């Protein structure tokens, strides 16, 4: 669900899921897909990606057990929906951090309705 | 959809609705409801209440139509979901505008797992 997402992004980047990214570029946040404005928002369009395969479950609202270990997310869920949701959340909270170096404020509150259309997934 | 509420929301706040509303309190933005810290988080917590009242329709992604007739928010909406989704946009967007006097700046992007456990709708 969107809560262990937002668990993920703060432990793997330290900032707040919502601040940094409710609404960076055209892909992280609310609304959909766009064009990638950069690295952080190729981030937020492949997770979305990862979100429209699950194609046995429900993303925004089914619940997950993962844990913290080493510093590492371990996604230990036994349902493989699940299990594939968590490792989409994993995926991007890792990509996230891995990208604060060009992260960009100007792209933080982003017009995403002005937004390039975005390839098919 | 989401188009709508956030133009809704700049039409009367004059505000933009993700920098300012997009993460605040317990209850605006993403992951569900809390117990709100003042008015405007209750706006949002309320808001929560009234979508899930809805009769079968999307909040985040159906469209519908409504009009700013001097300088206020009028669904013509005659689908009888998308109406009352149109309802219920309009009645947080007047809400957090009623309660701007009170907007606590500490309060946006308030970390939500600080948040204790909603009463039920
Ligand atoms: C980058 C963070 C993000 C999403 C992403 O991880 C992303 N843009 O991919 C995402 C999201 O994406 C899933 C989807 O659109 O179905 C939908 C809604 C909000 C979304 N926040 C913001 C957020 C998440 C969790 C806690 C607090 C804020
Ligand atoms: C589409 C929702 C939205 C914003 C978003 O959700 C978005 N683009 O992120 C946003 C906005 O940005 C959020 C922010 O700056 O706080 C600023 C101003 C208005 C904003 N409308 C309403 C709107 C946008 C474009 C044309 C007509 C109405
Ligand atoms: C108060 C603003 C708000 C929501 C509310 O109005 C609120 N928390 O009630 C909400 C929201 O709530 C509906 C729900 O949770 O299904 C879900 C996702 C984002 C939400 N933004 C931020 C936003 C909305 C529209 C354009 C730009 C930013």
Chains 1, 2 share one sequence.
Not at 80 to 97: H, N, Q, T, Y
Request: glycine share 8%.
């Amino acid at each position: 669900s969107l809560f262990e997402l937002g668990k993920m992004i703060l432990q793997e980047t330290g900032k707040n899921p919502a601040k940094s990214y409710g609404a960076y570029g055209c892909n992280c946040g609310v609304l959909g897909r766009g064009k990638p404005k950069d690295a952080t928002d190729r981030c937020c369009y492949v997770h979305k990606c990862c979100y429209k395969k699950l194609t046995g479950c429900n993303p925004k609202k089914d619940r997950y057990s993962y844990s913290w270990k080493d510093k590492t997310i371990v996604c230990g869920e036994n349902n493989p929906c699940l299990k594939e949701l968590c490792e989409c959340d994993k995926a991007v909270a890792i990509c996230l951090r891995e990208n604060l170096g060009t992260y960009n404020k100007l792209y933080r509150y982003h017009l995403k309705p002005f937004c390039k259309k975005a390839d098919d997934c």
